[PDB]
Amino acid sequence: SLRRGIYHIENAGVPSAIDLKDGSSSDGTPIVGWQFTPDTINWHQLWLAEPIPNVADTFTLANLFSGTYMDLYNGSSEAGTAVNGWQGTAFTTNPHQLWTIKKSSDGTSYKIQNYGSKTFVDLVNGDSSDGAKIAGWTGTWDEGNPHQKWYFNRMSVSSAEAQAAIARNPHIHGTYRGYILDGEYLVLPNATFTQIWKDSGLPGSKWREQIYDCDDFAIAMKAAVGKWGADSWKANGFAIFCGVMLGVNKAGDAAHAYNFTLTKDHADIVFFEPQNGGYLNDIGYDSYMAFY
Amino acid sequence: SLRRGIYHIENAGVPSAIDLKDGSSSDGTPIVGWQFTPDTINWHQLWLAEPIPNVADTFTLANLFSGTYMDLYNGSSEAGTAVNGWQGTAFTTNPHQLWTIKKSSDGTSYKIQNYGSKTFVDLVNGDSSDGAKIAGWTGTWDEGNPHQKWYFNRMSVSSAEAQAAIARNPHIHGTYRGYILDGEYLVLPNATFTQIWKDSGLPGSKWREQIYDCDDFAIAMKAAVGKWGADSWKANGFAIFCGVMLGVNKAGDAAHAYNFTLTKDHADIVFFEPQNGGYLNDIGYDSYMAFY
Numbered sequence: 001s002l003r004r005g006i007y008h009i010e011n012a013g014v015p016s017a018i019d020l021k022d023g024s025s026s027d028g029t030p031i032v033g034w035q036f037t038p039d040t041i042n043w044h045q046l047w048l049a050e051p052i053p054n055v056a057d058t059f060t061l062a063n064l065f066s067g068t069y070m071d072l073y074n075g076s077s078e079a080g081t082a083v084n085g086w087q088g089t090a091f092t093t094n095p096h097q098l099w100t101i102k103k104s105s106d107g108t109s110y111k112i113q114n115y116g117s118k119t120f121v122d123l124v125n126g127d128s129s130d131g132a133k134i135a136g137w138t139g140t141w142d143e144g145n146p147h148q149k150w151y152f153n154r155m156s157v158s159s160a161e162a163q164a165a166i167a168r169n170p171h172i173h174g175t176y177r178g179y180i181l182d183g184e185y186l187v188l189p190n191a192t193f194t195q196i197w198k199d200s201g202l203p204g205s206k207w208r209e210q211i212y213d214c215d216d217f218a219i220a221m222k223a224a225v226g227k228w229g230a231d232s233w234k235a236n237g238f239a240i241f242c243g244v245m246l247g248v249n250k251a252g253d254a255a256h257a258y259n260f261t262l263t264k265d266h267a268d269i270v271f272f273e274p275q276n277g278g279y280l281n282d283i284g285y286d287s288y289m290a291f292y
Numbered sequence: 293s294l295r296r297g298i299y300h301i302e303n304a305g306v307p308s309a310i311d312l313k314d315g316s317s318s319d320g321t322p323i324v325g326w327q328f329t330p331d332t333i334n335w336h337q338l339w340l341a342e343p344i345p346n347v348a349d350t351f352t353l354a355n356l357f358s359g360t361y362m363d364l365y366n367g368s369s370e371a372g373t374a375v376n377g378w379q380g381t382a383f384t385t386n387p388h389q390l391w392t393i394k395k396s397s398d399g400t401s402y403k404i405q406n407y408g409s410k411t412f413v414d415l416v417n418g419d420s421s422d423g424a425k426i427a428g429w430t431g432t433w434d435e436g437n438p439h440q441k442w443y444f445n446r447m448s449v450s451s452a453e454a455q456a457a458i459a460r461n462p463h464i465h466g467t468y469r470g471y472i473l474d475g476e477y478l479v480l481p482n483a484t485f486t487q488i489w490k491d492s493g494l495p496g497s498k499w500r501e502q503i504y505d506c507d508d509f510a511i512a513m514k515a516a517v518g519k520w521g522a523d524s525w526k527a528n529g530f531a532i533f534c535g536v537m538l539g540v541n542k543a544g545d546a547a548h549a550y551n552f553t554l555t556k557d558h559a560d561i562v563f564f565e566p567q568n569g570g571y572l573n574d575i576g577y578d579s580y581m582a583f584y
């Protein structure tokens with residue numbers, strides 16, 4: 001079954017993502033196909049899938065930027081029915097906003113079925129142009145039609161997935177303890193992680209003994225990413241990934257505070273030095289504590 | 293022996309503190325007696341005592357605001373010699389800036405002797421008016437003269453002292469682990485702690501599930517206090533006290549993130565709720581983790 005999380009949803013036949021037009025929170029804003037740039041935040045194209053309790057394989061889909069919900073207009077089962085953003089809530093009983101999402105007959109892409117209409121999210125005519133209509137349409141679970149197939153490319157990790165990534169790192173001290181703060185995390189491309197660092201004022205901050213030293217840079221980076229998350233997204237129910245670590249060197253005679261992020265594949269961590277913006281597979285310290 | 297730390301230094305005969313006039317970093321700025329307000333940050337009246345290695349009871353005294361050093365002008369042993377702020381470093385060999393500080397014959401106040409001249413810091417004539425001259429003067433270690441006696445009222449804690457304060461709290465979980473970031477900490481009056489919170493923007497921040505929830509408020513408060521410390525003080529070698537805690541309720545079914553500070557007596561901690569500015573002796577959670 002599809003996991004709770006944040007997805008970039010890409011048509012299987014042409015490289016168009018599901019896009020809430022202009023990111024607008026107005027009710028009735030069209031959801032359209034649109035091109036995308038890999039390894040970026042695609043600002044209007046991220047969707048938080050919230051599973052519904054006791055309704056197998058069925059979800060709301062909140063646009064991360066607008067906080068509004070994928071909605072089949074008036075629930076109609078007519079082919080060509082509008083799919084728009086619309087105000088709602090994560091666990092609504094409104095069928096217009098409830099979507100049964102299960103694997104297609106290719107085993108990798110998914111179909112997206114409205115729970116009330118039983119019709120499917122369809123890139124009309126397989127049109128690849130920017131702004132192409134997405135509609136509800138008649139269909140079947142098993143058929144090959146690529147207009148109705150969608151790759152759910154996962155952009156978040158659970159806390160357990162983050163924990164796993166840490167656990168297979170080679171630079172973890174024997175005394176390590178991790179402290180988990182949230183449940184579901186948007187993983188940032190390094191280009192975005194870097195941007196937040198640049199915009200934080202940290203690049204200009206001078207190292208000063210105790211009063212503005214490693215711990216202060218690492219905590220300030222984590223607070224900057226937290227502030228960015230809230231200021232940037234209107235949906236709730238997830239956090240932004242940015243860890244702090246405390247580590248000790250191999251000799252046991254120096255310790256350091258720094259940050260960490262995750263690889264593009266979500267399988268491994270990467271250290272970040274908030275005093276200079278560098279990313280390192282080996283920062284020269286084994287982590288004895290992390291919070292994230 | 294006097295401990296490394298930050299002191300407000302108050303004459304024993306009249307309630308005048310040792311004040312670097314206007315907080316000025318100019319070389320030759322006079323150090324004067326001046327009235328003070330208890331339970332405030334007295335901005336021009338805080339002094340960081342750095343012990344010198346292998347020189348018993350002898351220190352530099354850096355003004356916390358200016359980062360300049362108490363200096364006996366040209367080292368003269370003449371009575372009436374100026375005592376001024378002057379550029380220097382924490383472990384200088386310049387005797388003009390080195391001060392042997394030991395208890396007076398009352399056992400509670402201290403005398404402050406220049407290491408090169410062997411003369412003593414003296415509030416001339418015991419003058420209580422704002423701006424009264426402080427000079428080097430002839431004297432003895434044992435005599436009663438209040439012009440040369442000074443109470444060193446300690447405004448910082450060591451990390452070990454902070455640890456002790458935590459350890460005697462009644463609201464510490466059996467699994468608690470603390471992570472110590474710095475060595476010496478300025479303890480803020482709650483009036484100042486509050487000010488930093490108000491100025492941080494946190495009072496206006498809305499609680500939002502995961503994206504701006506308890507952990508984000510607590511971390512943002514700690515980062516605000518860190519930023520305030522660096523922006524406010526020019527001396528190095530100390531930090532500002534502001535902890536983060538993670539805690540669990542008595543039933544074991546709810547957890548929360550918050551901050552903590554220390555009492556005026558430095559003996560106990562006080563919890564702070566960064567979502568509303570409240571101070572509480574009991575926040576309803578036992579801490580299982582802290583960093584500070």
Ligand SMILES: C[C@@H]1O[C@@H](O[C@@H]2[C@@H](O[C@H]3O[C@H](CO)[C@H](O)[C@H](O)[C@H]3O)[C@@H](O)[C@@H](CO)O[C@@H]2O)[C@@H](O)[C@H](O)[C@@H]1O
Binds near residue numbers: 072075086
């Ligand atoms: C059958 C109809 O269902 C609800 O109205 C839906 C709309 O529902 C959503 O928006 C309205 C405001 O327009 C409201 O906030 C509601 O809680 C939310 O779920 C929406 O799905 C539109 C477009 O497809 O269709 C309906 O107008 C409900 O509010 C109505 O009273 C009525 O029961």
Ligand SMILES: C[C@@H]1O[C@@H](O[C@@H]2[C@@H](O[C@H]3O[C@H](CO)[C@H](O)[C@H](O)[C@H]3O)[C@@H](O)[C@@H](CO)O[C@@H]2O)[C@@H](O)[C@H](O)[C@@H]1O
Binds near residue numbers: 122124139143145147
């Ligand atoms: C090229 C074309 O592709 C398929 O038709 C799709 C449509 O497919 C869906 O709707 C049709 C009815 O119009 C039918 O219910 C089918 O099972 C269902 O998948 C639909 O995707 C539209 C809009 O994008 O485009 C095409 O018309 C195929 O069934 C046609 O025979 C034909 O090969």
Ligand SMILES: C[C@@H]1O[C@@H](O[C@@H]2[C@@H](O[C@H]3O[C@H](CO)[C@H](O)[C@H](O)[C@H]3O)[C@@H](O)[C@@H](CO)O[C@@H]2O)[C@@H](O)[C@H](O)[C@@H]1O
Binds near residue numbers: 365366367
């Ligand atoms: C004997 C004299 O000692 C030093 O000069 C001191 C001053 O020392 C402090 O300030 C100077 C700059 O004015 C410099 O930065 C130095 O490192 C610092 O310790 C100061 O104590 C004044 C006032 O009492 O007296 C002397 O001018 C040294 O720089 C001189 O070359 C010379 O050795």
Ligand SMILES: C[C@@H]1O[C@@H](O[C@@H]2[C@@H](O[C@H]3O[C@H](CO)[C@H](O)[C@H](O)[C@H]3O)[C@@H](O)[C@@H](CO)O[C@@H]2O)[C@@H](O)[C@H](O)[C@@H]1O
Binds near residue numbers: 414431435439
């Ligand atoms: C009222 C006055 O108090 C004392 O004299 C202080 C001075 O005391 C210090 O300097 C004198 C020499 O002038 C002497 O060396 C003494 O041992 C030493 O403490 C000094 O504090 C000045 C400036 O503030 O004020 C007074 O003159 C006392 O010795 C006097 O006899 C007299 O009672």
Ligand SMILES: C[C@@H]1O[C@@H](O[C@@H]2[C@@H](O[C@H]3O[C@H](CO)[C@H](O)[C@H](O)[C@H]3O)[C@@H](O)[C@@H](CO)O[C@H]2O)[C@@H](O)[C@H](O)[C@@H]1O
Binds near residue numbers: 019022
């Ligand atoms: C916020 C905004 O994002 C970008 O424009 C979006 C646009 O973004 C997608 O399409 C562009 C090309 O038009 C690129 O492929 C991006 O990588 C995609 O993410 C769409 O989402 C449309 C329709 O909703 O809205 C635009 O605002 C970017 O071009 C803007 O400069 C800006 O950063």
Ligand SMILES: C[C@@H]1O[C@@H](O[C@@H]2[C@@H](O[C@H]3O[C@H](CO)[C@H](O)[C@H](O)[C@H]3O)[C@@H](O)[C@@H](CO)O[C@H]2O)[C@@H](O)[C@H](O)[C@@H]1O
Binds near residue numbers: 311313314328334422
């Ligand atoms: C930064 C500045 O601090 C205060 O003025 C200082 C002054 O502060 C002391 O004396 C005042 C009365 O003049 C109060 O008792 C304070 O509680 C003391 O800390 C002195 O340090 C003088 C001489 O260096 O400089 C002034 O700037 C305050 O009155 C100002 O408004 C301001 O906040």
Ligand SMILES: *[C@@H](C(=O)O)[C@H](O)C(=O)N[C@@H](CC(C)C)C(=O)NCCCCNC(N)=[NH2+]
Binds near residue numbers: 245247256288473
């Ligand atoms: C880091 C820097 O600015 O380079 C700065 O030296 C610092 O604070 N170092 C601390 C450790 C960090 C907070 C992790 C430090 O060296 N502390 C002394 C020992 C305590 C940490 N080590 C262990 N294992 N407890």
Ligand SMILES: *[C@@H](C(=O)O)[C@H](O)C(=O)N[C@@H](CC(C)C)C(=O)NCCCCNC(N)=[NH2+]
Binds near residue numbers: 182507538540549580
């Ligand atoms: C706190 C709030 O905004 O009220 C928010 O619920 C939160 O993040 N709670 C977390 C705990 C904090 C990070 C301390 C939470 O409840 N986590 C679930 C359990 C993990 C924490 N408990 C223990 N002991 N590990």
Ligand SMILES: [Ca+2]
């Ligand atoms: Ca057909």
Ligand SMILES: [Ca+2]
Binds near residue numbers: 506
């Ligand atoms: Ca949380």
Ligand SMILES: [Ca+2]
Binds near residue numbers: 214531
């Ligand atoms: Ca620090």
Ligand SMILES: [Ca+2]
């Ligand atoms: Ca005398």
Ligand SMILES: [Ca+2]
Binds near residue numbers: 210213215474
């Ligand atoms: Ca430190």
Ligand SMILES: [Ca+2]
Binds near residue numbers: 182503505508
């Ligand atoms: Ca959070």
Ligand code: NA
Binds near residue numbers: 202203205
């Ligand atoms: Na730097």
Ligand code: NA
Binds near residue numbers: 496497567568
């Ligand atoms: Na509030």
